[PDB]
Amino acid sequence: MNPYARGPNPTAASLEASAGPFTVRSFTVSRPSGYGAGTVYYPTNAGGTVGAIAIVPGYTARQSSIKWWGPRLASHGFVVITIDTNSTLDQPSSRSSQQMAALGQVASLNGTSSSPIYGKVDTARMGVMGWAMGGGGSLISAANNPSLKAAAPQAPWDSSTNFSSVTVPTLIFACENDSIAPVNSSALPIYDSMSRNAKQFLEINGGSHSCANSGNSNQALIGKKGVAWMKRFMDNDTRYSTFACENPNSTRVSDFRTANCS
């Protein structure tokens, strides 16, 4: 009866694998509207319309830093747009505006008959992700747009840590040994500020600032968690509640916290 459920029942193995059940294709956005560039990843065989997620990099960075999420998420039934910002030196607020413009363009493309994603998106179900300043931008997006269904920033940074206005289910990936956005002054205070939402804090043991980026050695766990979080909250899919809410009880995790999760 959940009209948003897609794919086979999940297992730890299926979520830890490099690829999900659906086949993925991608394209470059010809005329980015409000951001620098973008790549759209989508499932070719999901079986119904799926939600959309927009992912932004950190300061100085480009799509390569976050690109692994595209196929990883899309293969589980999401349309994912990874973006380059107008400038590599844009700040979090600007990143947030750009992230939201990218979701808007995904909505446009869903209504464009020549697009490969024509009619593949449920525009009412969206999510936001991003690294560092792009993670802070994701949190700003969530605060300003509470109709967003899920947020999952990584190693976030904002000059302000008060995200008490965020009511969107938010999973914060953190990196233990982050020296750019130290956990104790960035990710953790951000997590602690959020009081009205389902939330989770997952710190990778021994991780540098780039611990959740393309090429990381914890793709099994990080990808399982990201996908589970998005499935649970973007699709209201309670088949993923244990995966989304559980403490992994893993040696790869140096700090785990969660609240209001079901």
Q: Could you tell me the sign of the dihedral formed by the alpha carbons of 240, 245, 206, 139, in that order? A: positive
Instruction: Using the Cα atoms of residue 156, residue 172, residue 41 and residue 101 in order, give the sign of their dihedral.
Output: negative
Resolution (A): 1.5
What method did the depositors use to determine the structure?
X-ray
In whole angstroms, give the CA distance from residue 25 to residue 49. 15
Rounded distance between C-alpha atoms, residue 121 and residue 119, angstroms = 6
Rounded to the nearest angstrom, the gap between the alpha carbon of residue 73 and the centroid of all alpha carbons in its chain is 9
Report the distance separating Cα 218 and Cα 258, nearest Å: 20
Q: How far is CA 208 from the centre of its chain?
A: 19
Query: 220 φ, ψ to 5°?
Result: -65, -55
Task: Give the H or E element holding residue 137.
Answer: helix 133-144
- Whats the size of the chain, residue-wise? 262
Residue 190 contacts residue 158 (beta carbons within 8 Å): yes
Q: Tell me whether residue 95 is exposed, middle or buried, using C-beta atoms within 10 angstroms of its C-beta: 0 to 12, 13 to 18, 19 or more.
A: buried
In this structure, are residues 223 and 231 in contact, taking their beta carbons and an 8 Å threshold?
no
For residues 174 and 183, give the distance between their C-alpha atoms in angstroms, rounded to a whole number. Answer: 7
CA distances from 229 to 146, 173, 174, 185 (A): 17, 12, 15, 24
Three-state secondary structure call for residue 175: strand
- Residue 251, Cβ neighbours under 10 Å: how many? 7
Rounded-to-integer distance, Cα 259 and Cα 220, Å: 23
d(C-alpha 245, C-alpha 226), whole Å: 11
Distance CA 102, CA 77 (A): 18
Domain segments of the chain as ranges: 1-262
From the options 3.30.710.10, 3.40.50.1820, 2.60.40.1180, 3.40.50.1100, give the CATH code of 1-262: 3.40.50.1820
Amino acid at 32: P
* Burial of residue 231 (number of CB atoms within 10 Å: 0-12, 13-18, 19+): buried
Identify residue 73 by its one-letter amino acid code: L
